[PDB]
Symmetry: C5
Subunit: 103 residues, 5 copies
């Protein structure tokens, strides 16, 4: 298994690492039909989503999508520094695949 | 895919944005039959609900409704500032579709 | 839908409002068979339960019963002020139907 | 329904009350197969388990077992004082049936 | 049942105890397909995973794997000291089987 987010991210196509080293500036979540998603931003203007679950996702990802939204909410509320995000860059906003937190 | 709450809200019929920029004043939840819901208020008097799950909701919204009540409870307890709510205005109290949190 | 806990409470028989305006003094939880319940008290001694799920409950209430126990535990640990409880008074201890928190 | 943990405990065979009036000293949890359980200790050395779910358990206890592990973890992390435990004493470590927390 | 993490760990083949007595330095989680996992590190460089649920795991472990990831997240965010990890050391990074928190 990968030992860090960068190596993990590199195992997939259409991804990139963003380095934030900053707490989340805003947290948005929606229960509206077909937009059951979360959106975060950072003070540098960067915006990211956790995608609406869809046919691109495999079954094993469903619980992990829900966990990620849990993680972003509590990170936001505790002002935890986000080190890096692994994202898919073929979506707008870029779609979160992985998160690391440090410092 | 929308990049913020305002753009997301605009995709739906019978919605509007309320700007609060304030912590939640009160949090109420019920387990009584047919009233399994949450109600929040702000010190300006504004009252909002998370609706009881019903036939106006698609399968994908059900988990998101449960998440929203989780979010409102922990926002209330941490005194997190609510920036905006996207609501359906064809319900009373107006029914929450989305929330953004920021300072 | 109801604007507040008092109006919600009045939609049901065998209920009353207790106004506490105080934090929970004690929290008790059981996994023992046929007693899978929570009990709370306030400083004055008044005692309330979240009932064991039973025949009186409709299916939609089951997730709400679990949420209520989650709410009581975190309210207890954070010393959140409980404003009101809506309770069924045909049980002993009185059985919680709804809770409002406000500072 | 019982008004408190001591009365609840007395409804069962093979139980006793431990009065700790102390925070949890250590919290242990395992995902290893057939040992999916939690263990806590107190500074006095007293050790308690949440049992692995088994044939002795009824369906209604499954969620409550998960909830108790949730409760012990957050009590441990918040340094919440544990008042009493109701335990089954026909197991080693003694198996938790119920917990009370008070200031 | 085992009374502590060291004795639990010894019940299994291909395990060892690591003694950290330190808070988690970094927390990483992924929702990417086939890498639905968490990774933690300590400041001494030690790196550990919660393995992706697979066919090595029995059904009772599935909920416990999710719980473990919940625990590591909240331990990280609260700066809780991790005492020991029981790991399988036939995986790289070593795969977490159990955790103890004290002190
Ligand atoms: N859009 C609809 C909005 C209006 N709603 C729907 C209709 N509601 C009233 C209909 C039922 N009224 C009740 O008072 C009621 C119903 C049920 N149901 C079946 O049993 C159970 C009740 O109490 C027990 O069950 C209670 C738990 O639910 C508790 O245990 C109590 O002690 C028992 O006596 C009480 C009012 C609110």
């Amino acid at each position: 298994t990968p030992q860090n987010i960068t190596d993990l991210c590199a195992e997939y196509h259409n991804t990139q690492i963003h380095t934030l080293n900053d707490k989340i500036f805003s947290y948005t979540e929606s229960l509206a039909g077909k937009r059951e998603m979360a959106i975060i931003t950072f003070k540098n203007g960067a915006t990211f989503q956790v995608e609406v679950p869809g046919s691109q996702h495999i079954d094993s990802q469903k619980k992990a999508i829900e966990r990620m939204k849990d993680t972003l909410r509590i990170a936001y509320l505790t002002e935890a520094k986000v080190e890096k995000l692994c994202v898919w860059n073929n979506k707008t906003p870029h779609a979160i695949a992985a998160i690391s937190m440090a410092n």
